[PDB]
């Protein structure tokens, strides 16, 4: 964890966005997520491949923290990426359906422990994920 945090911190400073996301996905710690969270989702969309973006939301869905502020960031990243992602990109055709399915299931598995604010926010997020699965 500690070696990885050091790399993440330096990638954020340099503005190495893809590198930040890829580093965190390889070592998806809570502390690392908090460093990465300095990078807004729009920068991620400009710099990361669709495969990497799907790797990222999958890892966010598994992260074992339900703290309100952290969960807010978790859900915002997932929402924005899933609304932006082109589910018809051939490069992700063999992963996009199972990844969206696993992402939804992962969030539901944690949902009993979400505060009421985020139980309600999840209903909205699930609708967005289901809409993307509906396209394909």
Numbering used by the authors: 935 to 1070
How is this structure described in the published paper?
Processing bodies (P-bodies) are cytoplasmic micrometer-scale ribonucleoprotein (RNP) foci that were initially identified in mammalian cells and that have now been observed in distant branches of eukaryotes. To obtain insights into the redundancy of P-body formation, we turned to the Pdc1 protein that was recently implicated in P-body integrity in S. pombe. Pdc1 is related to metazoan Edc4 (Ge-1, Hedls)19 and both proteins contain an N-terminal WD-40 domain and a central coiled-coil region. Pdc1 can thus interact with Edc3 through a number of HLMs at its far N-terminal region and with the decapping complex through the Ge-1c domain at its far C-terminal region.
Sequence alignments of the C-terminal region of the S. pombe Pdc1 protein with the C-terminal regions of the human, D. melanogaster and A. thaliana Edc4 proteins suggest the presence of a Ge-1C domain20 in the Pdc1 protein, although the sequence identity (17 %) is very low. We observe that resonance signals from residues that are located in the C-terminal helices of the Pdc1 Ge-1C domain are significantly perturbed. This result indicates that Pdc1 exploits a surface at the far C-terminus of the protein to directly contact the Dcp1:Dcp2 decapping complex.
